[PDB]
Amino acid sequence: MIGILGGGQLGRMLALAGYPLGLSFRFLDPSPEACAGQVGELVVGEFLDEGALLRFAEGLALVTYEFENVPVEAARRLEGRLPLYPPAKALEVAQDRLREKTFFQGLGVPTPPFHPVDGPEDLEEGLKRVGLPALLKTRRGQALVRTEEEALEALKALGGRGLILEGFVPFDREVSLLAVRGRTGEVAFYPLVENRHWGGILRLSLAPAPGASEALQKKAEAYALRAMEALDYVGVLALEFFQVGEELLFNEMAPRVHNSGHWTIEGAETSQFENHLRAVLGLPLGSTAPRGQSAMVNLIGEKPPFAEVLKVEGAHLHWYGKAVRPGRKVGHITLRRDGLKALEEGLARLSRLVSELPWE
Amino acid sequence: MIGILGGGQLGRMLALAGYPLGLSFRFLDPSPEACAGQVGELVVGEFLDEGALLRFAEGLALVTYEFENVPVEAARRLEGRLPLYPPAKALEVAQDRLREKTFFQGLGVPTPPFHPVDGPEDLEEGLKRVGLPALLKTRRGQALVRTEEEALEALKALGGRGLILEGFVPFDREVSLLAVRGRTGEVAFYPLVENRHWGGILRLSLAPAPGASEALQKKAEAYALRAMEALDYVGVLALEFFQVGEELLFNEMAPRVHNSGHWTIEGAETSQFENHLRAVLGLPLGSTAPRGQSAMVNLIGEKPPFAEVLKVEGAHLHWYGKAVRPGRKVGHITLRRDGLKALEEGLARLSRLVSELPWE
Ligand SMILES: Nc1ncnc2c1ncn2[C@@H]1O[C@H](COP(=O)(O)O)[C@@H](O)[C@H]1O
Ligand SMILES: Nc1ncnc2c1ncn2[C@@H]1O[C@H](COP(=O)(O)O)[C@@H](O)[C@H]1O
Ligand SMILES: [Cl-]
Ligand SMILES: [Cl-]
Ligand SMILES: [Cl-]
């Protein structure tokens, strides 16, 4: 029986992808309403409630996680008791912006100019050895700053410590590469994906990344291989980069299945969810070859009219079962066509059904 | 919340196709082990246990079924309280071989020669207007008869009443057409698929039916549409035919998703399970266009080595969660590639993992 820290939609989808393989699941989440509960055994409890933690761990074959901000303490507490994939280290690295950048910077992968900022002297200490405008964000929320003074004003009423200074980067687009490494050591890579954000929320994902170079792919995969092996990664790893020209600058890493990959459920030969499961289980990884072209559109804080989205062919609706609320991810729609024209035509139909969707 | 009579694997896959649509499920089944119980709330009770039957229906939005032989009594007993799709009549027709052939004969669809037999005088009465060899099947098991006396030497120890005489048919192959009709009245048709049985159990399904002509397909659909409209059918209907030449004879019908359609989970734009749900929900039906080519091989009373099947590309494993037992359907594997050559290469490698399959 697989145990999953986090009862969100990512966990809900891991379970749905696992039942066909005859697997079992148990989730842990502090909210009785976790949508994964509608699909498997859900244990309600705080991650730092040792009692709930150990109760949930009983009989488990292994433990993995879907909630990216899960307390690393809860993951390490169970690490001794049962197998845990990905390794707790990955959470550590991914949960601290500075620790994240240094790690990749140390692997030899490009990253925006960044500098640690704990004191006003640090802010200046690197405010120029970085640039301007730029971003100042908590290492563990964030604020873009243009004015040389708006910066020293930024740290104020933001914390004043434990922050990171990143040099704003004018990117052509944002892309991400979902990669996977089995318990056996085998690896696999999905086509790059173009992600579009708006209001600080992923709104649309285009796969494969439109135009993506053939060398661009190998480039991303290369960086990904380095990261996974460096961490003894097992499962699915999501790497987000900024694309400037033909360069890739590491932006963020998530030790788990990622939103920018939901299109793999029908748009790839093997979903990221099934592969994550195959990986942590020590089974042969499945093919990541794409099935035509996909457009992943998130459903944020609103419930589109089902009959209307289902009228579009190639459109695959996914409602998470969560209660609708402002800015909340309540589902997504994957449009899988076999020609960019058709794809672009269906996307037109769906854009009229979803708000705040930045597409033309 | 959709309620399903029967907790078998068909119900289990129905629920899996539904969660992505934000649906809920409740199953009713005599066995506490119903594999559907692993994916939804399962009420353990006999279909003729009125107490359990009504307890099960509490609050359901509608009720459908997967148990091929659910007592039609239980289906009609709820038809009053809530919507029931497909209509109970389809269950009556499907459960009586004579009523089945009689029905389709009336629609004008070809059927092997058949004659009712409830006594020695009837056997002869039709045993001549049919011709040996032939099959003497019980209307509700069966026996192939060659000898003029092996016939009379069959009705006994087989009943003697409520049997039907069918004229043995030398078919090129067997094929089935899955059709769907929603409340709205809209309809859809999957590609005909080629089914190969052995030991009286479906062993392999090839989709789309190899070589099937555009005319054959159109005819099969014509019959299907007549049957569906004649029954005010709502949901997925599975029609099995015998292909002899360029014509096909109706052999059997099942008012539900069918085994010969499991390849549609990944081999068609919309699975038979999602379309069945879309139909009974009054939602726009989904495209039935095939995604390349598929081969559906059943897993009978044996658990293949998972690592071994996942080794082959394009292979999709589906373990039902049932306890392995002789003759029991415990899972299946859908292999879908985009070229007949590749398709045959895979089948070759899988055919070494599964016993009793008539391959090549
Ligand atoms: N260094 C950067 N330069 C420009 N935009 C950025 C930078 N870092 C983050 N963003 C934007 O902020 C959003 C991501 O927020 P976050 O996930 O906390 O990094 C995306 O919409 C990015 O376009
Ligand atoms: N009229 C028929 N002529 C030849 N074979 C038949 C006939 N009816 C049924 N069968 C065979 O019996 C099996 C179907 O069993 P059943 O579904 O109970 O009719 C299949 O493997 C068929 O090949
Ligand atoms: Cl949730
Ligand atoms: Cl079962
Ligand atoms: Cl499905």
Side-chain angles (χ1 to χ4, degrees):
Chain A
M1 180 183 284
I2 295 176
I4 293 170
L5 261 18
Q9 64 279 357
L10 296 181
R12 176 192 176 87
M13 291 188 274
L14 282 164
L16 295 174
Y19 285 118
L21 292 172
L23 306 173
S24 298
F25 299 86
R26 180 181 294 157
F27 305 89
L28 202 198
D29 196 286
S31 176
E33 264 55 276
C35 66
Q38 297 158 30
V39 115
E41 185 183 354
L42 178 261
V43 172
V44 185
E46 303 290 355
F47 294 114
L48 294 184
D49 169 352
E50 205 167 15
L53 226 206
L54 301 174
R55 178 169 62 256
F56 144 94
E58 81 84 16
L60 295 175
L62 69 87
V63 173
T64 184
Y65 39 92
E66 60 104 70
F67 174 20
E68 204 191 328
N69 273 340
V70 66
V72 71
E73 296 79 52
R76 285 181 184 299
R77 176 75 183 77
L78 275 40
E79 205 165 24
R81 324 268 260 62
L82 53 259
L84 179 82
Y85 315 81
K89 185 187 180 66
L91 273 181
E92 207 95 56
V93 177
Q95 297 191 319
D96 188 324
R97 288 196 171 71
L98 170 50
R99 175 69 173 293
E100 208 178 14
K101 256 69 158 58
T102 71
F103 171 87
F104 273 73
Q105 167 177 282
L107 287 174
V109 318
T111 76
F114 70 96
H115 193 273
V117 299
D118 299 304
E121 174 171 51
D122 289 304
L123 171 50
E124 234 61 56
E125 174 62 56
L127 194 51
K128 207 300 167 65
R129 62 176 291 187
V130 170
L132 250 179
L135 296 74
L136 191 68
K137 30 191 169 181
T138 177
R139 289 160 70 256
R140 268 61 185 299
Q142 64 183 301
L144 172 53
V145 179
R146 311 191 184 72
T147 325
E148 214 281 0
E149 68 178 297
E150 186 179 59
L152 291 69
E153 204 304 297
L155 66 73
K156 184 77 170 185
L158 185 166
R161 166 176 284 290
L163 311 176
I164 181 174
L165 199 291
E166 277 185 52
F168 180 95
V169 58
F171 60 81
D172 295 335
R173 65 179 172 181
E174 277 179 277
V175 299
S176 72
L177 179 118
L178 293 315
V180 40
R181 181 171 176 281
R183 195 166 64 194
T184 63
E186 168 183 17
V187 303
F189 307 82
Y190 284 89
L192 276 174
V193 178
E194 166 173 342
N195 316 124
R196 298 188 180 172
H197 305 280
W198 193 265
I201 313 178
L202 173 68
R203 303 292 177 163
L204 181 88
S205 280
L206 297 168
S213 156
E214 205 275 57
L216 217 186
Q217 255 296 147
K218 266 55 182 56
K219 200 169 182 290
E221 295 189 52
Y223 299 137
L225 223 186
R226 289 212 271 286
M228 293 188 267
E229 302 195 301
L231 293 158
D232 259 67
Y233 205 87
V234 182
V236 167
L237 184 267
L239 256 32
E240 280 187 279
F241 301 85
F242 283 125
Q243 194 191 312
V244 193
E246 282 303 299
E247 283 308 301
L248 295 177
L249 309 179
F250 168 79
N251 166 50
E252 278 185 297
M253 77 119 85
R256 54 171 177 68
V257 284
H258 195 260
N259 195 168
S260 73
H262 297 341
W263 62 274
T264 67
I265 300 180
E266 33 265 315
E269 201 58 24
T270 310
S271 83
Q272 69 174 330
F273 303 109
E274 179 179 337
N275 252 163
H276 180 80
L277 252 28
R278 288 161 82 154
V280 308
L281 236 31
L283 295 164
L285 272 32
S287 176
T288 49
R291 289 175 185 163
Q293 280 176 292
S294 301
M296 197 289 303
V297 326
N298 274 342
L299 262 15
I300 309 298
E302 80 199 308
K303 185 173 182 173
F306 287 9
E308 219 62 20
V309 1
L310 276 11
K311 287 181 195 302
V312 185
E313 50 176 50
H316 298 89
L317 181 62
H318 283 269
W319 191 247
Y320 307 150
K322 303 164 69 181
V324 179
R325 299 194 183 306
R328 189 174 200 194
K329 297 191 177 172
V330 288
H332 77 268
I333 300 172
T334 289
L335 180 59
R336 195 204 66 66
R337 302 314 315 164
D338 300 73
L340 195 159
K341 180 166 286 58
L343 192 173
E344 195 139 38
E345 208 149 59
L347 232 175
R349 286 275 287 305
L350 296 171
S351 63
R352 305 172 189 159
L353 298 172
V354 179
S355 66
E356 296 179 304
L357 179 56
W359 183 78
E360 237 97 77
Chain B
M1 179 180 282
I2 294 175
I4 290 167
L5 297 174
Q9 66 278 352
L10 297 179
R12 172 186 170 101
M13 292 190 268
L14 238 9
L16 265 5
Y19 285 115
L21 296 183
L23 305 174
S24 287
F25 299 87
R26 177 133 68 205
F27 301 89
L28 202 203
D29 195 287
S31 172
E33 311 305 343
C35 65
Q38 291 155 31
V39 302
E41 68 168 299
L42 174 269
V43 170
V44 183
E46 284 291 357
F47 298 116
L48 291 182
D49 173 348
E50 211 172 16
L53 195 61
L54 283 311
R55 179 170 60 252
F56 158 79
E58 169 275 311
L60 301 174
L62 67 89
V63 173
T64 189
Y65 40 83
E66 56 93 71
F67 204 96
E68 182 57 351
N69 289 313
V70 278
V72 72
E73 293 72 281
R76 291 174 173 305
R77 184 53 231 288
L78 295 173
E79 203 163 27
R81 317 170 70 79
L82 49 286
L84 190 282
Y85 313 96
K89 184 185 180 190
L91 219 53
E92 308 245 15
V93 175
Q95 292 181 0
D96 187 307
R97 293 164 182 291
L98 166 54
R99 191 133 150 52
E100 216 174 10
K101 261 75 156 53
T102 283
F103 177 76
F104 275 89
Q105 175 170 282
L107 275 301
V109 321
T111 81
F114 66 98
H115 193 285
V117 303
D118 300 311
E121 184 173 359
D122 292 298
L123 177 49
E124 266 57 60
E125 151 63 59
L127 187 51
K128 205 305 177 65
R129 56 187 293 184
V130 171
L132 285 174
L135 298 75
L136 187 65
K137 317 175 188 175
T138 179
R139 295 161 74 267
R140 276 73 182 302
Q142 63 184 302
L144 174 50
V145 173
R146 314 194 191 74
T147 312
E148 228 291 2
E149 75 163 299
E150 187 177 60
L152 298 70
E153 286 295 301
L155 63 72
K156 306 186 188 306
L158 181 69
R161 309 179 301 282
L163 278 55
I164 180 173
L165 203 289
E166 287 187 59
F168 182 97
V169 56
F171 54 77
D172 301 339
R173 63 178 176 178
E174 298 188 65
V175 300
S176 67
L177 184 121
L178 308 184
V180 38
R181 179 169 181 282
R183 284 182 200 150
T184 69
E186 170 193 11
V187 301
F189 308 88
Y190 284 90
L192 280 167
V193 319
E194 187 187 311
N195 313 130
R196 300 186 184 175
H197 308 271
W198 189 268
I201 311 174
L202 178 62
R203 301 291 177 165
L204 171 75
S205 280
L206 275 20
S213 59
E214 193 267 62
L216 195 60
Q217 177 66 50
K218 278 303 170 182
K219 181 161 51 177
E221 291 184 45
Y223 298 172
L225 181 49
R226 299 183 191 168
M228 297 197 273
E229 301 180 305
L231 296 159
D232 292 339
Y233 201 98
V234 177
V236 166
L237 175 62
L239 262 40
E240 285 183 287
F241 298 94
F242 288 129
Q243 189 191 298
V244 183
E246 308 182 319
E247 179 49 59
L248 55 192
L249 316 173
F250 167 79
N251 167 48
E252 184 181 0
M253 75 128 91
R256 52 168 180 70
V257 281
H258 193 257
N259 195 167
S260 79
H262 296 345
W263 60 274
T264 67
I265 294 177
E266 43 274 289
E269 213 52 47
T270 313
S271 79
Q272 68 174 332
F273 306 109
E274 186 181 349
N275 256 160
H276 177 78
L277 294 176
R278 282 159 88 148
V280 310
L281 235 31
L283 289 164
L285 265 48
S287 175
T288 59
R291 230 129 75 175
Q293 263 156 291
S294 305
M296 196 288 306
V297 358
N298 267 340
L299 300 180
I300 312 301
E302 68 183 309
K303 186 175 183 173
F306 287 13
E308 239 52 89
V309 331
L310 276 14
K311 284 294 180 186
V312 16
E313 177 174 349
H316 300 91
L317 181 66
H318 285 271
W319 191 245
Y320 309 148
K322 309 205 277 171
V324 176
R325 220 93 59 46
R328 172 109 104 148
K329 290 190 177 176
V330 292
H332 77 267
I333 296 173
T334 293
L335 198 184
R336 82 150 217 65
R337 317 243 88 284
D338 300 75
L340 193 155
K341 182 80 291 292
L343 195 292
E344 293 188 293
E345 299 192 296
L347 264 183
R349 226 209 306 184
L350 289 166
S351 72
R352 303 173 191 159
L353 297 172
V354 178
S355 76
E356 308 175 66
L357 55 46
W359 182 225
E360 220 68 303

